[PDB]
């Protein structure tokens, strides 16, 4: 069974580690009490050598005996991030066996312990930047040999299946499969195909749809929840919003429209009728002086669209430390039809990746999508990366970015 919505009638975990970095920034106390997910993005995060056990104990303490909800990100597939120029994932493409025995299994072992406390809800975010690569990045300009390999060897599909079963058996664990964002799989050509692959994964490695509680979009990304001034079917004089360089015949201009349609598609495919969707609104506020306060007046199609849209990125494929971004809507329960919650999965202020080479021992290769000077590739419309300068290694505190995110918060603080 498990509750219909693990966020409903629950307190939310506050990560003391994250909170201390937020409160330390000028004005950071205003958001230092917000709930953020704990990221298990490598084997070493499990024991922490705060480990998972440490965060879960803290969540229990914060609960006081009433329902409480902690979000844990599962993110260590073999051949991780198969389309990226560089991946920080420690597990290689042939390492599914290590994924199963040294990553999932010990996490399962810790969550099982905590099943004894009825009022703790563990929402597990399952493998970001995974399955949709096997739809969109296997052929053509932008295809990678790594993605083709992971599709051929079933490493993503079977890895994900495994996590769903192992964590899904556990009574108070609520699995959400990552579902990219509308600027990735919103097209007529990849939406259905993504749905098919989600279903494949959910039935792989002994899993069933009964181990999937829902889906999460926009995780660690910047796509708008709603675009207030843009109608995907609207027009600028005789020209459709659809034909703009921004929209590019996507079926959607925002995340909410997207996850609502996806939710219906998935149920039709054979997922449970009571699936709920999440959207990560950590960094998609797009507020501050540059935020449109109403629709453009321009007669140019692209000037109307560029001046009316709150997501101001150059291209929706720009994912790294995005310039001008702002904190989004704060974590909130059942905000819209079919959405269990808006969540802050990415903890704001933590870098997405280094903007130059920063030599390291923990195995984190320089990804040029984080480099301000990078001129792009097929996957971002061959555009500037849009990344903020002088960024630390992924997960390290990025003060310039936190101050900006904080000043650009929408709704304001």
Tab-separated table of C-alpha atoms in Angstrom:
chain	number	residue	atom	x	y	z
A	1	UNK	CA	0.000	0.000	0.000
A	2	UNK	CA	2.094	2.850	1.388
A	3	UNK	CA	0.421	6.271	1.629
A	4	UNK	CA	-1.124	7.792	-1.521
A	5	UNK	CA	1.248	10.759	-1.290
A	6	UNK	CA	4.249	10.528	0.992
A	7	UNK	CA	4.453	14.342	1.189
A	8	UNK	CA	0.834	14.621	2.372
A	9	UNK	CA	0.506	15.376	6.120
A	10	UNK	CA	4.244	15.024	6.672
A	11	UNK	CA	7.002	17.259	7.989
A	12	UNK	CA	9.937	17.498	5.567
A	13	UNK	CA	13.569	16.645	6.411
A	14	UNK	CA	16.013	19.568	6.801
A	15	UNK	CA	19.609	18.621	5.985
A	16	UNK	CA	21.745	20.149	8.748
A	17	UNK	CA	24.828	20.062	6.498
A	18	UNK	CA	23.155	22.039	3.681
A	19	UNK	CA	21.334	24.312	6.104
A	20	UNK	CA	24.613	25.485	7.684
A	21	UNK	CA	26.023	26.642	4.325
A	22	UNK	CA	22.799	28.449	3.357
A	23	UNK	CA	22.402	30.283	6.693
A	24	UNK	CA	26.052	31.412	6.462
A	25	UNK	CA	25.439	33.417	3.281
A	26	UNK	CA	24.090	36.971	3.613
A	27	UNK	CA	20.312	36.507	3.825
A	28	UNK	CA	20.652	32.730	3.522
A	29	UNK	CA	18.739	32.105	6.757
A	30	UNK	CA	15.522	32.876	4.823
A	31	UNK	CA	15.852	29.548	3.024
A	32	UNK	CA	18.135	27.561	5.332
A	33	UNK	CA	15.099	25.738	6.826
A	34	UNK	CA	13.953	24.369	3.463
A	35	UNK	CA	13.998	20.625	2.706
A	36	UNK	CA	16.645	19.349	0.233
A	37	UNK	CA	17.367	15.812	-0.949
A	38	UNK	CA	20.385	13.856	0.274
A	39	UNK	CA	22.413	12.737	-2.748
A	40	UNK	CA	23.943	9.297	-2.818
A	41	UNK	CA	25.986	9.979	-5.932
A	42	UNK	CA	28.812	7.551	-5.158
A	43	UNK	CA	29.509	4.440	-3.050
A	44	UNK	CA	31.263	6.541	-0.369
A	45	UNK	CA	28.170	8.622	0.363
A	46	UNK	CA	26.403	5.587	1.831
A	47	UNK	CA	28.632	5.277	4.906
A	48	UNK	CA	29.725	8.915	4.498
A	49	UNK	CA	33.052	7.637	5.875
A	50	UNK	CA	26.894	12.244	7.390
A	51	UNK	CA	26.189	8.891	5.764
A	52	UNK	CA	22.759	7.590	4.858
A	53	UNK	CA	22.341	6.122	8.352
A	54	UNK	CA	23.338	9.513	9.827
A	55	UNK	CA	20.743	11.434	7.753
A	56	UNK	CA	18.037	8.891	8.486
A	57	UNK	CA	18.652	9.090	12.251
A	58	UNK	CA	18.403	12.877	11.971
A	59	UNK	CA	15.127	12.549	10.038
A	60	UNK	CA	13.716	10.296	12.811
A	61	UNK	CA	14.728	12.862	15.430
A	62	UNK	CA	13.088	15.699	13.454
A	63	UNK	CA	9.858	13.667	13.097
A	64	UNK	CA	8.968	13.644	16.813
A	65	UNK	CA	6.726	10.648	16.137
A	66	UNK	CA	4.605	12.293	13.408
A	67	UNK	CA	5.021	11.527	9.674
A	68	UNK	CA	8.214	12.966	8.103
A	69	UNK	CA	9.645	12.736	4.587
A	70	UNK	CA	13.305	12.613	3.501
A	71	UNK	CA	14.348	12.533	-0.092
A	72	UNK	CA	17.299	10.367	-1.133
A	73	UNK	CA	18.773	10.532	-4.669
A	74	UNK	CA	19.949	7.193	-6.119
A	75	UNK	CA	22.523	8.083	-8.770
A	76	UNK	CA	25.376	5.700	-9.606
A	77	UNK	CA	24.456	3.647	-12.707
A	78	UNK	CA	27.253	1.932	-14.623
A	79	UNK	CA	28.343	4.104	-17.556
A	80	UNK	CA	26.562	7.015	-15.872
A	81	UNK	CA	25.484	10.103	-17.812
A	82	UNK	CA	26.276	8.310	-21.115
A	83	UNK	CA	25.866	11.397	-23.340
A	84	UNK	CA	28.003	13.745	-21.246
A	85	UNK	CA	31.476	14.898	-22.287
A	86	UNK	CA	32.698	13.808	-18.854
A	87	UNK	CA	30.997	11.856	-16.088
A	88	UNK	CA	31.683	11.954	-12.376
A	89	UNK	CA	29.996	8.556	-11.951
A	90	UNK	CA	32.591	6.184	-10.567
A	91	UNK	CA	31.034	3.085	-12.095
A	92	UNK	CA	32.026	2.176	-15.646
A	93	UNK	CA	29.829	0.734	-18.417
A	94	UNK	CA	30.634	-2.909	-17.621
A	95	UNK	CA	30.198	-2.480	-13.859
A	96	UNK	CA	26.511	-3.446	-13.346
A	97	UNK	CA	27.533	-6.180	-10.891
A	98	UNK	CA	29.283	-3.583	-8.654
A	99	UNK	CA	26.262	-1.315	-8.937
A	100	UNK	CA	24.063	-4.120	-7.619
A	101	UNK	CA	26.265	-5.497	-4.833
A	102	UNK	CA	28.255	-2.467	-3.601
A	103	UNK	CA	25.772	0.369	-4.163
A	104	UNK	CA	22.060	-0.694	-4.186
A	105	UNK	CA	22.324	-3.655	-1.759
A	106	UNK	CA	23.964	-1.687	1.139
A	107	UNK	CA	21.494	1.173	0.615
A	108	UNK	CA	18.662	-1.333	0.771
A	109	UNK	CA	20.176	-2.743	3.972
A	110	UNK	CA	20.124	0.664	5.677
A	111	UNK	CA	16.593	1.572	4.560
A	112	UNK	CA	15.307	-1.779	5.784
A	113	UNK	CA	16.533	-0.990	9.288
A	114	UNK	CA	14.491	2.195	9.244
A	115	UNK	CA	11.282	0.449	8.075
A	116	UNK	CA	10.654	-0.187	11.779
A	117	UNK	CA	9.646	3.460	12.168
A	118	UNK	CA	6.203	3.742	10.577
A	119	UNK	CA	6.024	7.514	10.314
A	120	UNK	CA	9.247	7.921	8.297
A	121	UNK	CA	8.706	8.210	4.545
A	122	UNK	CA	11.751	7.759	2.323
A	123	UNK	CA	11.146	9.177	-1.149
A	124	UNK	CA	13.886	7.761	-3.423
A	125	UNK	CA	14.717	9.565	-6.662
A	126	UNK	CA	15.799	6.862	-9.120
A	127	UNK	CA	18.785	7.609	-11.427
A	128	UNK	CA	18.790	11.034	-13.042
A	129	UNK	CA	20.163	11.560	-16.561
A	130	UNK	CA	19.649	7.840	-17.387
A	131	UNK	CA	16.849	6.178	-19.364
A	132	UNK	CA	15.939	9.031	-21.751
A	133	UNK	CA	19.512	8.959	-23.144
A	134	UNK	CA	18.621	5.550	-24.638
A	135	UNK	CA	15.791	7.227	-26.593
A	136	UNK	CA	17.517	10.375	-27.849
A	137	UNK	CA	21.295	9.925	-27.699
A	138	UNK	CA	21.839	6.541	-29.416
A	139	UNK	CA	21.928	7.664	-33.060
A	140	UNK	CA	22.404	10.731	-35.264
A	141	UNK	CA	24.266	13.958	-34.580
A	142	UNK	CA	24.572	13.904	-30.788
A	143	UNK	CA	24.508	10.126	-30.447
A	144	UNK	CA	27.232	8.649	-28.253
A	145	UNK	CA	28.958	5.265	-28.420
A	146	UNK	CA	28.578	5.043	-24.643
A	147	UNK	CA	24.770	5.406	-24.791
A	148	UNK	CA	24.460	2.875	-27.634
A	149	UNK	CA	26.541	0.456	-25.510
A	150	UNK	CA	24.376	0.906	-22.387
A	151	UNK	CA	21.264	0.328	-24.537
A	152	UNK	CA	22.767	-2.774	-26.101
A	153	UNK	CA	23.974	-4.216	-22.776
A	154	UNK	CA	20.820	-3.261	-20.837
A	155	UNK	CA	22.868	-1.662	-18.054
A	156	UNK	CA	20.546	1.297	-17.462
A	157	UNK	CA	17.325	-0.688	-17.904
A	158	UNK	CA	18.451	-3.575	-15.673
A	159	UNK	CA	20.209	-1.322	-13.126
A	160	UNK	CA	17.084	0.809	-12.708
A	161	UNK	CA	14.896	-2.328	-12.492
A	162	UNK	CA	17.087	-3.668	-9.735
A	163	UNK	CA	16.814	-0.460	-7.654
A	164	UNK	CA	13.071	-0.378	-8.074
A	165	UNK	CA	12.736	-3.909	-6.766
A	166	UNK	CA	15.258	-3.680	-3.923
A	167	UNK	CA	14.037	-0.347	-2.623
A	168	UNK	CA	10.414	-0.975	-3.663
A	169	UNK	CA	10.117	-4.047	-1.432
A	170	UNK	CA	10.880	-1.816	1.613
A	171	UNK	CA	7.560	-0.754	3.253
A	172	UNK	CA	8.183	2.983	3.725
A	173	UNK	CA	10.192	3.660	0.562
A	174	UNK	CA	8.519	5.572	-2.280
A	175	UNK	CA	10.292	5.253	-5.636
A	176	UNK	CA	10.151	7.991	-8.242
A	177	UNK	CA	11.765	7.351	-11.623
A	178	UNK	CA	13.509	10.381	-13.050
A	179	UNK	CA	11.696	11.566	-16.197
A	180	UNK	CA	14.096	14.185	-17.533
A	181	UNK	CA	12.365	17.470	-18.488
A	182	UNK	CA	10.201	18.856	-21.251
A	183	UNK	CA	13.137	20.384	-23.089
A	184	UNK	CA	14.517	16.857	-23.550
A	185	UNK	CA	11.643	14.456	-24.150
A	186	UNK	CA	8.714	16.749	-24.957
A	187	UNK	CA	8.682	16.120	-28.741
A	188	UNK	CA	6.253	13.918	-30.665
A	189	UNK	CA	9.285	11.747	-31.541
A	190	UNK	CA	10.679	11.034	-28.046
A	191	UNK	CA	7.758	11.395	-25.580
A	192	UNK	CA	6.110	8.035	-26.426
A	193	UNK	CA	9.512	6.289	-26.772
A	194	UNK	CA	10.518	7.513	-23.288
A	195	UNK	CA	7.233	6.168	-21.879
A	196	UNK	CA	8.046	2.777	-23.406
A	197	UNK	CA	11.532	2.732	-21.866
A	198	UNK	CA	10.236	3.727	-18.412
A	199	UNK	CA	7.897	0.732	-18.636
A	200	UNK	CA	10.694	-1.567	-19.818
A	201	UNK	CA	12.819	-0.541	-16.771
A	202	UNK	CA	9.951	-0.959	-14.311
A	203	UNK	CA	9.487	-4.543	-15.500
A	204	UNK	CA	13.225	-5.372	-15.648
A	205	UNK	CA	15.323	-7.311	-13.062
A	206	UNK	CA	12.233	-8.684	-11.311
A	207	UNK	CA	10.532	-5.300	-10.885
A	208	UNK	CA	6.851	-4.548	-11.629
A	209	UNK	CA	4.984	-1.224	-12.004
A	210	UNK	CA	3.884	-1.872	-8.404
A	211	UNK	CA	7.387	-0.736	-7.306
A	212	UNK	CA	6.979	2.684	-8.968
A	213	UNK	CA	5.175	5.293	-6.922
A	214	UNK	CA	5.652	8.034	-9.451
A	215	UNK	CA	7.956	10.106	-11.582
A	216	UNK	CA	10.054	13.241	-11.088
A	217	UNK	CA	10.819	15.934	-13.652
A	218	UNK	CA	13.253	18.839	-13.837
A	219	UNK	CA	15.655	17.261	-11.304
A	220	UNK	CA	18.648	19.571	-10.806
A	221	UNK	CA	17.457	21.491	-13.901
A	222	UNK	CA	15.953	24.878	-14.653
A	223	UNK	CA	12.842	24.378	-16.842
A	224	UNK	CA	9.840	26.493	-15.854
A	225	UNK	CA	6.972	24.942	-13.836
A	226	UNK	CA	4.491	27.168	-15.697
A	227	UNK	CA	5.349	29.810	-18.311
A	228	UNK	CA	2.880	32.562	-17.302
A	229	UNK	CA	3.067	34.579	-20.541
A	230	UNK	CA	3.521	31.802	-23.087
A	231	UNK	CA	0.811	29.646	-24.657
A	232	UNK	CA	2.212	26.680	-26.616
A	233	UNK	CA	-0.695	27.134	-29.075
A	234	UNK	CA	-0.578	30.950	-29.150
A	235	UNK	CA	0.717	33.140	-31.950
A	236	UNK	CA	2.804	36.247	-32.692
A	237	UNK	CA	0.935	37.851	-35.563
A	238	UNK	CA	0.624	34.989	-38.114
A	239	UNK	CA	3.471	32.954	-36.596
A	240	UNK	CA	3.015	30.111	-34.110
A	241	UNK	CA	4.804	29.994	-30.756
A	242	UNK	CA	5.608	26.430	-31.917
A	243	UNK	CA	7.932	27.640	-34.686
A	244	UNK	CA	10.108	29.828	-32.451
A	245	UNK	CA	13.778	29.035	-31.946
A	246	UNK	CA	13.053	28.468	-28.214
A	247	UNK	CA	10.014	26.192	-28.446
A	248	UNK	CA	11.201	24.386	-31.625
A	249	UNK	CA	7.948	22.373	-32.043
A	250	UNK	CA	8.073	20.925	-28.592
A	251	UNK	CA	4.601	19.952	-27.393
A	252	UNK	CA	5.282	21.823	-24.145
A	253	UNK	CA	6.766	25.122	-22.954
A	254	UNK	CA	6.831	24.150	-19.243
A	255	UNK	CA	7.150	21.241	-16.799
A	256	UNK	CA	3.641	21.130	-15.421
A	257	UNK	CA	1.915	20.623	-18.776
A	258	UNK	CA	4.554	17.993	-19.507
A	259	UNK	CA	4.322	15.825	-16.346
A	260	UNK	CA	0.504	15.929	-16.498
A	261	UNK	CA	0.483	14.536	-20.044
A	262	UNK	CA	3.287	12.091	-19.178
A	263	UNK	CA	1.294	10.879	-16.135
A	264	UNK	CA	-1.634	9.940	-18.405
A	265	UNK	CA	0.634	8.327	-21.019
A	266	UNK	CA	2.312	6.210	-18.334
A	267	UNK	CA	-0.931	4.954	-16.848
A	268	UNK	CA	-2.113	4.014	-20.363
A	269	UNK	CA	1.156	2.103	-20.879
A	270	UNK	CA	0.413	0.145	-17.687
A	271	UNK	CA	1.594	2.025	-14.595
A	272	UNK	CA	-0.592	2.268	-11.469
A	273	UNK	CA	-3.620	4.597	-11.718
A	274	UNK	CA	-2.542	6.426	-8.556
A	275	UNK	CA	0.950	7.527	-9.668
A	276	UNK	CA	1.811	11.084	-8.615
A	277	UNK	CA	4.387	13.340	-10.248
A	278	UNK	CA	7.098	15.537	-8.708
A	279	UNK	CA	8.759	18.656	-10.151
A	280	UNK	CA	12.040	19.964	-8.729
A	281	UNK	CA	11.577	23.730	-8.340
A	282	UNK	CA	14.875	24.341	-6.500
A	283	UNK	CA	16.276	26.595	-9.203
A	284	UNK	CA	13.484	27.430	-11.650
A	285	UNK	CA	12.026	30.606	-10.134
A	286	UNK	CA	13.609	32.785	-12.822
A	287	UNK	CA	12.897	35.921	-10.819
A	288	UNK	CA	14.634	39.253	-10.366
A	289	UNK	CA	14.967	42.339	-12.619
A	290	UNK	CA	15.123	40.233	-15.805
A	291	UNK	CA	11.856	38.402	-15.183
A	292	UNK	CA	9.082	39.450	-17.592
A	293	UNK	CA	6.175	41.124	-15.768
A	294	UNK	CA	3.822	40.432	-18.690
A	295	UNK	CA	3.762	39.402	-22.377
A	296	UNK	CA	6.083	41.049	-24.917
A	297	UNK	CA	4.787	43.721	-27.281
A	298	UNK	CA	7.185	42.809	-30.114
A	299	UNK	CA	5.916	41.738	-33.558
A	300	UNK	CA	8.930	39.480	-34.071
A	301	UNK	CA	8.262	35.804	-33.277
A	302	UNK	CA	11.586	35.217	-31.553
A	303	UNK	CA	11.636	38.608	-29.812
A	304	UNK	CA	8.109	37.972	-28.430
A	305	UNK	CA	9.139	34.550	-27.159
A	306	UNK	CA	12.554	35.644	-25.836
A	307	UNK	CA	11.012	38.658	-24.005
A	308	UNK	CA	7.993	36.807	-22.524
A	309	UNK	CA	9.620	33.607	-21.247
A	310	UNK	CA	10.762	33.241	-17.646
A	311	UNK	CA	13.230	30.439	-18.458
A	312	UNK	CA	15.872	32.709	-20.023
A	313	UNK	CA	18.371	30.028	-21.012
A	314	UNK	CA	19.926	29.975	-24.490
A	315	UNK	CA	18.765	26.393	-25.054
A	316	UNK	CA	16.933	23.858	-22.879
A	317	UNK	CA	19.963	21.509	-23.091
A	318	UNK	CA	22.029	23.971	-21.025
A	319	UNK	CA	22.098	22.271	-17.613
A	320	UNK	CA	25.204	23.497	-15.785
A	321	UNK	CA	25.222	26.333	-13.228
A	322	UNK	CA	22.835	28.396	-15.341
A	323	UNK	CA	23.460	32.180	-15.390
A	324	UNK	CA	20.727	34.305	-13.840
A	325	UNK	CA	18.701	31.424	-12.433
A	326	UNK	CA	16.662	31.951	-9.269
A	327	UNK	CA	15.305	29.841	-6.424
A	328	UNK	CA	11.912	28.433	-7.347
A	329	UNK	CA	8.677	27.821	-5.475
A	330	UNK	CA	9.357	26.349	-2.066
A	331	UNK	CA	8.597	22.659	-1.431
A	332	UNK	CA	4.808	22.268	-1.433
A	333	UNK	CA	2.255	19.447	-1.335
A	334	UNK	CA	-0.163	18.511	-4.174
A	335	UNK	CA	0.060	21.934	-5.945
A	336	UNK	CA	-1.703	20.789	-9.140
A	337	UNK	CA	-3.663	17.849	-10.662
A	338	UNK	CA	-1.472	14.706	-10.597
A	339	UNK	CA	1.529	16.267	-8.826
A	340	UNK	CA	2.375	14.831	-5.355
A	341	UNK	CA	4.639	17.810	-4.654
A	342	UNK	CA	7.028	20.420	-5.788
A	343	UNK	CA	10.366	19.424	-4.250
A	344	UNK	CA	13.900	20.823	-3.866
A	345	UNK	CA	15.925	17.788	-4.907
A	346	UNK	CA	19.096	19.644	-6.008
A	347	UNK	CA	20.345	21.582	-2.980
A	348	UNK	CA	20.781	25.202	-4.155
A	349	UNK	CA	24.286	26.635	-3.787
A	350	UNK	CA	25.864	23.308	-4.556
A	351	UNK	CA	27.720	23.487	-7.854
A	352	UNK	CA	26.673	21.419	-10.870
A	353	UNK	CA	30.337	20.937	-11.896
A	354	UNK	CA	33.683	22.723	-12.330
A	355	UNK	CA	33.994	25.519	-14.927
A	356	UNK	CA	37.661	24.700	-15.629
A	357	UNK	CA	39.881	21.736	-14.908
A	358	UNK	CA	40.264	21.444	-11.145
A	359	UNK	CA	42.654	18.536	-10.442
A	360	UNK	CA	41.177	16.019	-7.990
A	361	UNK	CA	41.519	12.558	-6.424
A	362	UNK	CA	37.814	11.664	-6.327
A	363	UNK	CA	37.524	11.028	-10.075
A	364	UNK	CA	35.624	13.987	-11.519
A	365	UNK	CA	36.477	14.779	-15.148
A	366	UNK	CA	36.162	18.246	-16.658
A	367	UNK	CA	32.795	18.541	-18.450
A	368	UNK	CA	32.866	21.443	-20.913
A	369	UNK	CA	29.101	22.011	-20.599
A	370	UNK	CA	30.083	23.705	-17.292
A	371	UNK	CA	32.670	25.863	-19.046
A	372	UNK	CA	31.339	29.358	-19.844
A	373	UNK	CA	33.472	29.487	-23.005
A	374	UNK	CA	32.245	26.179	-24.485
A	375	UNK	CA	30.437	26.629	-27.808
A	376	UNK	CA	28.213	23.589	-27.431
A	377	UNK	CA	27.435	20.443	-29.356
A	378	UNK	CA	24.466	18.784	-31.079
A	379	UNK	CA	22.707	18.217	-27.718
A	380	UNK	CA	22.464	21.926	-26.829
A	381	UNK	CA	21.835	23.387	-30.314
A	382	UNK	CA	25.568	24.166	-30.628
A	383	UNK	CA	25.181	27.132	-28.268
A	384	UNK	CA	27.232	28.758	-25.534
A	385	UNK	CA	26.945	26.590	-22.405
A	386	UNK	CA	25.383	29.410	-20.408
A	387	UNK	CA	27.298	28.301	-17.321
A	388	UNK	CA	28.386	30.668	-14.533
A	389	UNK	CA	32.170	31.363	-14.328
A	390	UNK	CA	34.542	30.140	-11.586
A	391	UNK	CA	32.406	27.207	-10.371
A	392	UNK	CA	33.841	24.580	-7.950
A	393	UNK	CA	33.612	20.776	-8.317
A	394	UNK	CA	30.062	19.408	-8.437
A	395	UNK	CA	28.444	19.485	-4.979
A	396	UNK	CA	30.975	21.982	-3.580
A	397	UNK	CA	29.627	25.239	-2.264
A	398	UNK	CA	29.215	27.917	-4.955
A	399	UNK	CA	28.721	31.252	-3.178
A	400	UNK	CA	28.427	33.526	-6.212
A	401	UNK	CA	25.692	31.175	-7.502
A	402	UNK	CA	23.869	31.001	-4.164
A	403	UNK	CA	23.753	34.807	-3.810
A	404	UNK	CA	22.387	35.076	-7.375
A	405	UNK	CA	19.886	32.253	-6.879
A	406	UNK	CA	18.820	33.943	-3.668
A	407	UNK	CA	18.332	37.429	-5.202
A	408	UNK	CA	16.432	35.947	-8.157
A	409	UNK	CA	14.028	33.837	-6.066
A	410	UNK	CA	10.425	33.664	-7.328
A	411	UNK	CA	8.062	33.990	-5.492
A	412	UNK	CA	10.348	36.435	-3.659
A	413	UNK	CA	11.394	35.872	-0.029
